[PDB]
């Protein structure tokens, strides 16, 4: 046996910083990626179509992704 205390610098502060950084990143990363995948799955992408005669679309109708259109 003969366990000896390994002298080391204090590792509480950097671990706490990394933990709270990961927590505060994920607390908004998870809902935005859930919203993005629900937009992709349920709302879905656009479809390309030719311009009909007599229609002048708005500018946001010239784009594909719903987030880009918004």
């Amino acid at each position: 046996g003969k366990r000896l205390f390994i002298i080391k610098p204090s590792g509480f502060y950097d671990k706490r910083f990394l933990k709270l950084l990961r927590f505060y990143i994920l607390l908004t990363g998870i809902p935005v990626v859930i919203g993005i995948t629900l937009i992709n799955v349920f709302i879905g992408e656009a479809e390309l179509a030719e311009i009909p005669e007599g229609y002048v679309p708005e500018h946001w109708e010239y784009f594909k992704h719903p987030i880009s259109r918004w």
Partner: protein
């Protein structure tokens, strides 16, 4: 020409003080008191 008594006494004193510190580096079997997960 070996150790003079002054440096020999100083080296001896520092020797058992260093050995006392080295044995003082040992931990009790109760340690570490890890927090319950």
């Amino acid at each position: 020409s070996g150790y003079t008594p002054d440096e020999k006494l100083r080296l001896q004193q520092l020797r058992e003080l260093r050995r006392r510190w080295l044995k003082d580096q040992e931990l009790s079997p109760r340690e570490p008191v890890l927090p319950p997960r």
